Design a protein around this ligand. Structure first.
Ligand code: MG
Ligand code: MG
Ligand code: MG
Ligand code: MG
Ligand code: MG
Ligand code: MG
Ligand code: MG
Ligand code: MG
Ligand code: MG
Ligand code: MG
Ligand code: MG
Ligand code: MG
Lengths: 109, 190, 138, 176, 199, 247
RNA sequence: GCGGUGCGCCGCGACCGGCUCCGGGACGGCUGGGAAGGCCCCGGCGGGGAAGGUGGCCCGGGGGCCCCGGGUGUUACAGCC
RNA sequence: GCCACUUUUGGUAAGCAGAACUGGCGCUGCGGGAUGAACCGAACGCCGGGUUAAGGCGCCCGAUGCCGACGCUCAUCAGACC
RNA sequence: GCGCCGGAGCCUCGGUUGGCCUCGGAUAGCCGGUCCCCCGCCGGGGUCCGGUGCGGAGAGCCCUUCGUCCCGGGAAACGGGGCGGCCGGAAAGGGGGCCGCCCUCUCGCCCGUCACGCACCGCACGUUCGUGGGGAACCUGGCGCUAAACCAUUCGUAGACGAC
């Protein structure tokens, strides 16, 4: 009856300075800011959730307007606990600075 | 290098009372109460001895440009003690060749009107900054006694009238006129 | 003014580094920013330590500036530091921090169910004190 | 040589190859300072080419080993004689340091020579490092640690660990 | 959901660097009391840099020129805009997320202000160096409202002092309540002390 | 190369958007700074320009070559009927400036002042302030009005009163009067609002505002002269006769 | 039931292999057959040495026997080499 | 034809003119040098994963949000990368 | 034919997934109490007692959501929920506090006794702020309002034309 996903912000794509590579998202996960702490989140299921105009299906429920783009959390990125991720479809750049959920359920505990 | 410790003590006489509110100092004695805020100077101020005999200022880990501030605090504090126990008296004399300088004191020490300097009609009104008193003395012809507690106010009010009586656009090596500081000293001799 | 002084024989809690969370006894001073140190009754081997990882505390045990680890252990266990440290308020809040870090899920639930009523009783005691202060004010 | 990391002390010996002129050459020994033995043997051939008529080819190394610090748990004073090249002309120096290890004092020597004089490690060549008793010390910044009753606080504890609470509500305390 | 930062004691660009990245990450940041921002270096160098910024001006029509904003809040807004990529939609969305005020207005006087120790002058300057107040520089260079903001800040400091006294006497009542009721909350207290919330 | 002979610049850049002004009557950009020692006084008035006339007077200035001689001097006559006060406006000082707090009008407002709220007085059915003027003759209404006069006493710093001309006394064609905020400089906010509301809805003549032999400042739009060239507007030098594309 | 081929769309898991980035245990070699350090001076027996000089003694002052400053000198009620 | 390390001629000198060796540009993208024919790295079929070079890691802008080490430095014209 | 107060749905824009209701400020110094001492219209200082790697801690605080059913203990009784009057707000105004009221409760909280609630058969956008912002007509009542602007004409303080 509460939240079952960690909060993350789509900081950008995996990018050089004059080149960006849209196949890999960069996720800043709230609370973890160091590579010793990012190890819990490797291989987690992450998801970008958004609404739309016309209805789509929903598995185990009624058709509604919310939609997703699923993905995994591949490996860490830099010393500040920033992490990489790969999604099934590459993210639209609408999502720069929007709340990507990072689930718990591919669990290793 | 950085010197690991530099300290000096200042002996505090029996009639005067210094105390500390952090880094600022306050001094109470016979003539009045005089405070000063040292919060720009980053030292340690211990008040040691019971019957309050010594003010020990010490600075840890200083370069020489900030170890220079160690005994300048001692100089300001013992100048403060001198100004509270004994007070300060700057007797500055009027010097003129032809036209006499007419000094008239208004609002009991607080304003000085200087007239007839080099013959000109412009009256010079100089205000003493608050806490010092100017007075035309007796037993001397043309003298101005500035009495106060703190030397910054006394000597600054003296320097205001010495910068007021100035000869401009002429040869200052021939025109030796104006009021100049003559005898720095003390109201009550020890 | 200051009250904790780096000198020969002060113990110091260590903030971080390899020996994070232990006491050491400062033996001698090498530089402006480094010191020969030894915690012999806590397994900190004789070594140098920078000053900016060690938080000097208010326990001074007396031994000379060149003394060996034998005599540092003698002075340590004669002053009996390891009980004074466990008895002081510093390590009590260190150990309380470590307890709520160690806190599991089930006892986090138990602490929630406890502190809910432990605040409810306080809150109505506070408001009955407030109405008592009002009736004494009028 | 670049002074990468802490330097190590290498006792290194060498000699010319045996020739039909003389059956055996004399053996030559240096205390040198280098990050590892490869650059150590390079600096050995540098100084022995600078002193004797010996080179990489006409000579050979005999034993390049490390000297460990013979008492590394006792703080010691080190006098270090130097010879470095400025922008205009070279200069001899005597600098004093205070350290646990000889190699640590020579590392600190390279560090503050590069700090104060912008002298780089290829320009700085060592010549004599010795452990000096506390009365023979000439330098004031080292001599003012020579007190059995040494005592000083840590006055302005600037805040390490800034970005762990980044947005907090407390102003940090710098008095401890 | 909104950071409220205080501005007193913070360095100008060293605060703007955290604020710029934090706003690009989607936060809503309100940096309040921006006449208390410090700038390192002494006051005369800092106002010479700002007067140089005033002299830099479009020659043929200064109406199109660099709009030198004289208010302290808008000096800080211009330096955050200098750190943000404001020519594009994500930088302009960032500048829409940022709100910056002079003094502490009534939407945010009743809230608690954050501080950034990584930008704070008591941390990132040596104590013997000179610094410069942005409010006094802005008044010095053509901002007109130092006096009215100072009187309004004196008023809110008085009203917050009244609030703080009442909060103190409430928490005194709280601790007297705890000492009156500890005999019958002792079984609830010690289970918190064994889990390290209360020693 | 440089300019051959240096000459000063034609015109002034201080008055630079030389446009038709947006407002017909000139407005006061700054009143005199009030000090609480003075009695309360209006710091402006509003009158209309009539014409030009000589005077003859004996000048008593010592040291001139016209001392106790007798000049003539050109004068201007501004016909200046007593203005009718209609409402008071309060202002609070803000870090963004000085914003208006609470405007409060009078009960009875003259029709020549009512005309100002209408771009067409003919076709309108003249309904202005009719729901507002009922706030004076009921008890809940004047309790609301004493409430916001009490609020203006507490929170305002400068207080300026609306006053309009009394156009039915002038020989002009128009009837629509001119309204103006005049700042009441004088005592405190309390004494200022007391004076303002007790002289609300009634008149005030010239002599209560200005005194004789007093330097004043005159504000207004100039006499419009149309779209005009650089010679008649900026007074640049006419190029010589031989010029091909006009001189 | 067996074998092949596929699922209308959206998904998940399992093990195996390849390629990688780490993490965690544990064992051994060499060296000055590591250097120092640990425990059995207040490791054992005699011998010395000085100081960043402990006791003690003296001088001084802050006190109420403690602390501080200076001097003397060689283990004393600390130690070091 | 042009440029560049070093050698070198004329000229005070030149983003000047003239040679030698070798590499480049021209014919050549790509990362870096903000910008850029020639500099540093590196030469290219279309892609996924890992890793680097040169250069970097407050923010623009990926990466120091290390509890980085030792010093020097106050500029009313600071300094900041072939 | 419009505005406020008092229903079920439809189109569209989307972001979100507990709140933190506040001293001032120093940083070689702070925070909290007591007041026994002294002044000012409760505040401020002195003495004293506590803490000071801050625990009267943003490393923090508050709330904590499976629901109902019986019965028992601890807590509550002065409390919970729901109508009139008093104040508290102006920098960009507070959905706060207080006196009763007819109502009704031992239900709310913490430990236990008792079972029941599609146990939807391992599987994703679940769980909120949401009576969300904006747009249409279906709607039923009540207390209220029936205006200006622009053209055209005129003026000529204005004017290339507009504009004024
Ligand atoms: Mg002359
Ligand atoms: Mg000229
Ligand atoms: Mg012609
Ligand atoms: Mg050429
Ligand atoms: Mg080719
Ligand atoms: Mg190429
Ligand atoms: Mg460049
Ligand atoms: Mg290359
Ligand atoms: Mg090369
Ligand atoms: Mg690749
Ligand atoms: Mg860059
Ligand atoms: Mg949702």
């Amino acid at each position: 009856s509460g939240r079952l996903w960690c909060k993350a912000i789509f900081a950008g794509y995996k990018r050089g300075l004059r080149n960006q590579r849209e196949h890999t998202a960069l996720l800043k996960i709230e609370g973890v800011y160091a590579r010793d702490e990012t190890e819990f989140y490797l291989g987690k299921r992450c998801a970008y959730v958004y609404k739309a105009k016309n209805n789509t299906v929903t598995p185990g429920g009624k058709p509604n307007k919310t939609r997703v783009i699923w993905g995994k959390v591949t490996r860490a990125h830099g010393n500040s606990g920033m992490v990489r991720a790969k999604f099934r479809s590459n993210l639209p750049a609408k999502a720069i600075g929007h709340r990507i959920r990072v689930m718990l359920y591919p669990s290793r505990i | 290098m950085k010197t690991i410790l530099s300290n000096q003590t200042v002996d505090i006489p029996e009639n005067v009372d210094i105390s500390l509110k952090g880094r600022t100092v306050i001094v109470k004695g016979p003539r009045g109460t005089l405070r000063r805020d040292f919060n720009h100077i980053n030292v340690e101020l211990s008040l040691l001895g019971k019957k309050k005999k010594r003010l020990r200022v010490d600075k840890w880990w200083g370069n020489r440009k900030e170890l220079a501030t160690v005994r300048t605090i001692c100089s300001h504090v013992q100048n403060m003690i001198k100004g509270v126990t004994l007070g300060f008296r700057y007797k500055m004399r009027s010097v003129y060749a032809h036209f006499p300088i007419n000094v008239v004191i208004q609002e009991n020490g607080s304003l000085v009107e200087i007239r007839n300097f080099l013959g000109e009609k412009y009256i010079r009104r100089v205000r003493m900054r608050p806490g010092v008193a100017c007075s035309v003395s007796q037993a001397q012809k043309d003298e101005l006694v500035l009495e106060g507690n703190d030397i910054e106010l006394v000597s600054n009010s003296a320097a205001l009238i010495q910068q007021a009586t100035t000869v401009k656009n002429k040869d200052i090596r021939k025109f030796l006129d104006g009021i100049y500081v003559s005898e720095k000293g003390t109201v009550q001799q020890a | 003014v200051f009250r904790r002084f780096v000198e020969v024989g002060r113990v110091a809690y260590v903030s971080f580094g390899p020996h994070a969370g232990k006491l050491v006894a400062i033996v001698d001073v090498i530089d402006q920013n480094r010191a020969l140190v030894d915690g012999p009754c806590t397994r900190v081997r004789r070594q140098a330590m920078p000053f900016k990882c060690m938080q000097l505390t208010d326990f001074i045990l007396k031994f000379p500036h060149s003394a060996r680890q034998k005599y540092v252990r003698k002075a340590w266990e004669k002053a009996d530091i390891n009980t004074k440290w466990a008895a002081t308020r510093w390590a009590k809040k260190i150990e309380a921090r470590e307890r709520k870090a160690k806190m599991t899920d089930f006892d986090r639930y138990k602490v929630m169910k406890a502190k809910k009523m432990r605040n409810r009783i306080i809150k109505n005691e506070v408001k009955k004190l407030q109405r008592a202060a009002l009736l004494k004010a009028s | 040589m670049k002074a990468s990391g802490t330097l190590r002390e290498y006792k290194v010996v060498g000699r010319c190859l045996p020739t039909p002129k003389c059956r055996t050459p004399p053996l030559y020994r240096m205390r040198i300072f280098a990050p590892n033995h490869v650059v150590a043997k390079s600096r050995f051939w540098y100084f022995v080419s600078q002193l004797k008529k010996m080179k990489k080819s006409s000579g050979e190394i005999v034993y390049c080993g490390q000297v460990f610090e013979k008492s590394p748990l006792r703080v010691k004073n080190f006098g270090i004689w130097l010879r470095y090249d400025s922008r205009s002309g070279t200069h001899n120096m005597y600098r004093e340091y205070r350290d646990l290890t000889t190699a640590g004092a020579v590392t600190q020597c390279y560090r503050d020579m590069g700090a104060r004089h912008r002298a780089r490690a290829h320009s700085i060549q060592i010549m004599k490092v010795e452990e000096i008793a506390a009365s023979k010390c000439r330098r004031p910044a080292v001599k003012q640690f020579h007190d059995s009753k040494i005592k000083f606080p840590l006055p302005h504890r600037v805040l390490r660990r800034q970005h762990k609470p980044r947005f907090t509500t407390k102003r940090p305390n710098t008095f401890f | 959901q909104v950071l409220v930062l205080d501005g007193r004691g913070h360095l100008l660009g060293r605060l703007a660097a955290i604020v710029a990245k934090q706003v690009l990450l989607g936060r809503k940041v309100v940096v309040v009391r921006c006449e208390g921002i410090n700038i390192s270096g002494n006051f005369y160098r800092n106002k010479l840099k700002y007067l140089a910024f005033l002299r830099k001006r479009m020659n043929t029509n200064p109406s199109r020129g660099p709009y030198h904003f004289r208010a302290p809040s808008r000096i800080f807004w211009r330096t955050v805009r200098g750190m943000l990529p404001h020519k594009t939609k994500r930088g302009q969305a960032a500048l829409d997320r940022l709100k910056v005020f002079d003094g502490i207005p009534p939407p945010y006087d009743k809230k608690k202000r954050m501080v950034v120790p990584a930008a704070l002058k008591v941390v990132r300057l040596k104590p013997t160096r000179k610094f410069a107040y942005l409010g006094r520089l802005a008044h010095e260079v053509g901002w007109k409202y130092q006096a009215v903001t100072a009187t309004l800040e004196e008023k809110r400091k008085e009203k917050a002092k009244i609030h703080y006294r009442k909060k103190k006497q409430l928490m005194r009542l709280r601790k007297q309540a705890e000492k009156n009721v500890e005999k019958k909350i002792s079984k609830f207290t010690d289970v918190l002390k064994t889990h390290g919330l209360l020693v | 190369s440089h300019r051959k002979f240096s000459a000063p610049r034609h015109g002034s850049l201080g008055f630079l958007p030389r446009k038709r002004s947006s407002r017909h009557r000139g407005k006061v950009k700054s009143f005199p700074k009030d000090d609480p020692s003075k009695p309360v006084h209006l710091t402006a008035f509003l009158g209309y320009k009539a014409g030009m006339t000589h005077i003859v007077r004996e000048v008593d200035r010592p040291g001139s070559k016209v001392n106790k001689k007798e000049v003539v001097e050109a004068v201007t006559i501004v016909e200046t009927p007593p203005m009718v006060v209609v409402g008071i406006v309060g202002y609070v000082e803000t870090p963004r400036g000085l914003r208006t707090f609470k405007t409060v009008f009078a009960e009875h407002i003259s029709d020549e002042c009512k005309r100002r709220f209408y771009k067409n007085w003919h076709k309108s059915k003249k309904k202005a302030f009719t729901k507002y003027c009922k706030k004076w003759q009921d008890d809940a209404g004047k309790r609301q009005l004493d409430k916001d006069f009490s609020s203006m006493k507490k929170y305002c710093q400068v207080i300026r009163v609306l006053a309009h001309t009394q156009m039915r006394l002038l020989p002009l064609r128009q009837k629509k009067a001119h309204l103006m905020e005049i700042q009441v400089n004088g005592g405190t906010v309390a004494e200022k609002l007391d004076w303002a509301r007790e002289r609300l809805e009634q008149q005030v003549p010239v002599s209560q505002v200005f005194g004789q032999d007093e330097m004043i400042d005159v504000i207004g739009v100039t006499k419009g002269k149309g779209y005009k060239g650089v010679t008649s507007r900026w007074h640049t030098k006419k190029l010589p006769r031989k010029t091909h594309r006009g001189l």
